[PDB]
Design a binder for this molecule. Sequence first.
Ligand code: UPA
Ligand code: UPA
Lengths: 124, 124
Amino acid sequence: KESAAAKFERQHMDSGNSPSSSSNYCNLMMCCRKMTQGKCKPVNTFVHESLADVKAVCSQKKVTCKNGQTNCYQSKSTMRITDCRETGSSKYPNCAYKTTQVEKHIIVACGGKPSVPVHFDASV
Amino acid sequence: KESAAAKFERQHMDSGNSPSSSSNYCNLMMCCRKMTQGKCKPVNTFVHESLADVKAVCSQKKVTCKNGQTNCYQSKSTMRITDCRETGSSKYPNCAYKTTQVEKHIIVACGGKPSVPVHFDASV
Ligand SMILES: Nc1ncnc2c1ncn2[C@@H]1O[C@H](COP(=O)(O)O[C@@H]2[C@H](O)[C@@H](CO)O[C@H]2n2ccc(=O)[nH]c2=O)[C@@H](O)[C@H]1O
Ligand SMILES: Nc1ncnc2c1ncn2[C@@H]1O[C@H](COP(=O)(O)O[C@@H]2[C@H](O)[C@@H](CO)O[C@H]2n2ccc(=O)[nH]c2=O)[C@@H](O)[C@H]1O
């Protein structure tokens, strides 16, 4: 069982000078979206365009994936994204990330029927 | 078993215009701290002072809790906190919170041995 004390720290403590700061986006999102469980995911990109714009990439420019697979597609237009990269000081389970906001073309792998994004490959 | 498609949405989609806006502190925090599972927790306060400064409240002014319990203590000093209150639009699984930052005295319930904070009761 989680102790009542640890449970209070989880639910009410966030000690620090400016916790609502932009630079904390990846830290909280990586945590919210469950990519800090069991291990820290080193690299993850979030996309801020509509789901419909991202699903459409699966119909755009076909490119080879970094890992040599051939189901990747590059976007025609540049998208608003955020890059979450694990920092130097990061150590499970104190997962820490640098937050980088950029606008770039994305490459996704697509799969299933109907074909939708199943993997973020890179940005250019 | 999570589909590859739903997984992609969970891991990379954060559609919106200002995703790292301070006003999103509560939506991210409430998700990270696991208070948006099963139901949306309606009220929840985060304290930005250090843990020792909060643990110390358990040795300050003893006061009655709002539910009639007698193990509540009120900080001697005001503290930096953030109130997260569910908005009218909020409906699980689409929980949404207003973030409000104030400086107020807190009232916690303390328990165990040593006696530490186990519940957040109110701020004044
Ligand atoms: N061609 C493919 N088809 C289907 N699934 C694939 C393919 N290539 C990789 N995958 C899988 O997709 C799964 C999900 O991974 P993702 O969330 O996309 O993770 C990305 C990538 O797999 C991982 C390792 O490099 O980092 C992320 N990543 C990488 C670079 C980047 O700029 N941004 C980003 O999010 C991984 O298990 C991987 O095995
Ligand atoms: N005196 C007490 N001793 C021990 N546990 C208690 C006591 N009073 C309530 N509890 C329990 O404390 C547990 C944890 O609750 P909390 O995380 O503090 O939640 C607070 C409160 O219980 C919940 C319901 O109102 O909202 C929060 N809350 C309320 C007001 C506020 O300003 N801020 C805030 O975080 C609850 O399960 C409750 O049963």
